[PDB]
């Protein structure tokens, strides 16, 4: 006695998968590089842009298999690809090895990152979770739509992020699954701790992160960590455990060199129930974070370089334990310097089309 | 620092190839390029090309692309060169020269172009 | 391509020393100067147009920029009839080339 029927504009999502568009803000007239790719293949930003409530709408992320990540870590390597030419690009393919090797033309250039906004195509919607204690998965209790997303600066970096937009409430750790020693920990700061770094007018530098901040802001975390541990087993920062050179140390890039501050000053403490410095050397010869290979630039220029900006997170690994438990950093796949930062939204499409049983007779 | 000693002397004929050895002890190996440059009596000297040691990449000169190789073994510490297409013109003197690089075993290299230390000198003779 | 001058200069002894090594166009600052009596091996001097290498005397120093270069030797000695000879090394991809060199005698 119950027949289907067949109702036009409820509201339903199916969550889908297209190729989003940059958003940011050029100059036109500048020549570094970034400000000069921006320009080539991005749109200037929204004028007016429209944000929208919902209203009691429960809603299942997921940050760990999310799928706007590749199409920036796309983006980022032709962005790079374009703009920092080696001057000997060794590339082993040997699937004895086949390594071959391209020379170029290689000059120095300016190199500082912009904000990059990607905005949804005509036809999807994209949800934000306005929440302040989503842990990483499962439903967030209150969700937007907007069509841009916010301001997302194109860093890299290993150890230790930099420019890392912050929380609100607490420092929280957002795990793989936890409990099994092999996924990279994720932090946040709800204060940012600003570094300076640079090289004076011998290829080394100094690494000053001002201090007494660094013990009470690894003094916030320390206790959310015993947040799932019992009270006990006292925890710590040790040394690397060793490895490539490029995952025992902190790299980055700033204004066209490559620094590697030897950060195991900062992981040394150990937690019961006025300056610090880190010897920055430059180096020239790297292993790309692209692809498997390696490069070689050009000896760095001759006056002073400066960079200066706030850390906001951390990569972190366990160890096999059993008591006690030690933290030794690492991290190193670039993947996740965007998790960090694209792990509040989603891109879904919309289908009005719904069926349900009720009581009808057409005839 | 490095003590360079080329190879002997030697005497050949048109159509075949020439190969030599530097013998370079004294220091690490992998932490010189080397070029290889040579001078007919009575002349000019001229540059050849250039070699890596680390990233195993070399270079050559305009005027002999392609009819002519080097090539060098981090397990042996010895740097060899073969010339192609052999012509009678190519009796002259050949010298084996480095440069020093810094501790490129960490990753920093400083990409010199000229040349510090120098071998004896290696004198090839091609005709009938 | 490297001009130099003279072709070989010939000058007493007790007297000052003054080659010139010049080139097409700006080879900045990568220019090396060698020094061989005939029958040896030949050897450093300067490199970077502005610097001694070592075990050298300070006799021995050159100047200029540019294209235009000159070694300077502001007192003859025993040992300083031989070929001298220019090279640049600047441009990338290497390709380096030499000059005609220059000699010096009583």
């Known amino acids: 006695n119950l027949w289907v029927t067949v109702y036009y504009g409820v509201p339903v999502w199916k969550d889908a998968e297209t190729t989003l568009f940059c958003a940011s803000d050029a100059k036109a007239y500048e020549t570094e590089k970034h400000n000069v790719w921006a320009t080539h293949a991005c749109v200037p930003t929204d004028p007016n842009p429209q944000e929208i409530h919902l209203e009691n709408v429960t809603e299942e992320f997921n940050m760990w298999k999310n799928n706007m990540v590749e199409q920036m870590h796309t983006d980022i390597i032709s962005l790079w690809d374009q703009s920092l030419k080696p001057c000997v690009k060794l590339t082993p393919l040997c699937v004895n090895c086949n390594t071959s090797a391209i020379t170029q033309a290689c000059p120095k250039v300016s190199f500082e990152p912009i904000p990059i906004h990607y905005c949804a195509p005509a036809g999807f919607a994209i949800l934000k979770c306005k929440d302040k204690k989503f842990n990483g998965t499962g439903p967030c209790p209150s969700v937007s739509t907007v069509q841009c997303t916010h301001g997302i600066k194109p860093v890299v970096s290993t150890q230790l992020l930099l420019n890392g937009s912050l929380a609100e409430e607490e420092v929280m750790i957002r795990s793989e699954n936890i409990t099994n020693n092999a996924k990279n920990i994720l932090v946040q700061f709800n204060t940012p701790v600003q570094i300076n770094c640079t090289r004076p007018n011998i290829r080394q530098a100094h690494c000053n992160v001002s201090k007494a901040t660094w013990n009470e802001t690894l003094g916030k975390v320390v206790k959310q960590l015993r947040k799932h541990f019992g009270n006990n087993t006292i925890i710590r920062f040790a040394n690397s455990s060793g490895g490539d050179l490029e995952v025992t140390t902190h790299s980055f890039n700033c204004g066209g060199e490559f620094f590697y501050c030897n950060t195991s000053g900062l992981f040394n403490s150990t937690w019961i129930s006025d300056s610090i410095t880190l010897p920055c050397r430059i180096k020239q010869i790297i292993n790309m974070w692209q692809r498997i290979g390696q490069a070689m630039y050009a000896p760095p220029i001759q006056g002073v370089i400066r960079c200066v900006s706030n850390i906001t997170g951390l990569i972190l690994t366990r160890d096999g334990g059993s008591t006690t438990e030690t933290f030794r950093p690492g991290g190193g796949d670039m993947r996740d310097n965007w998790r960090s930062e694209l792990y509040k939204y989603k891109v879904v499409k919309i289908e009005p089309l719904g069926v349900a049983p009720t009581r009808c007779k057409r005839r | 620092e490095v003590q360079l000693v080329e190879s002997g002397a030697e005497v050949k004929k048109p159509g075949s190839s020439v190969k030599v050895s530097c013998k370079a002890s004294?220091?690490?190996?992998?932490?010189?390029?080397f070029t290889w440059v040579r001078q007919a009596p009575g002349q000019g000297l001229e540059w050849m090309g250039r070699i890596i040691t680390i990233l195993d990449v070399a270079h050559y000169a305009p005027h002999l692309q392609g009819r002519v190789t080097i090539t060098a073994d981090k397990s042996t510490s010895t740097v060899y060169l073969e010339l192609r297409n052999l012509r009678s013109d190519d009796t002259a003197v050949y010298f084996c020269?480095?440069?020093?690089?810094?501790?490129?075993?960490?990753?920093?290299?400083?990409?010199?172009?000229?040349?510090?230390?120098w071998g004896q000198g290696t004198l090839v003779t091609v005709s009938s | 391509v490297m001009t130099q001058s003279p072709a070989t200069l010939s000058v007493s002894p007790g007297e000052r020393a003054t080659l010139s090594c010049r080139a097409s166009?700006?080879?900045?600052?990568?220019l090396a100067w060698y020094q061989q009596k005939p029958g040896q091996a030949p050897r450093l001097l300067i490199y970077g147009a502005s610097t001694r290498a070592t075990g050298v005397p300070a006799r021995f120093s050159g100047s200029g920029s540019g294209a235009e270069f000159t070694l300077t030797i502001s007192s003859l000695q025993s040992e300083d009839f031989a070929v001298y000879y220019c090279?640049?090394?600047?441009?990338?991809?290497?390709?380096?080339?030499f000059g005609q060199g220059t000699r010096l005698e009583i």
């Open positions: 090279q640049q090394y600047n441009n990338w991809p290497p390709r380096y080339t």
């Open positions: 004294g220091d690490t190996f992998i932490r010189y390029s």
């Open positions: 166009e700006s080879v900045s600052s990568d």
């Open positions: 020269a480095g440069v020093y690089e810094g501790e490129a075993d960490e990753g920093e290299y400083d990409n010199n172009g000229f040349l510090k230390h």
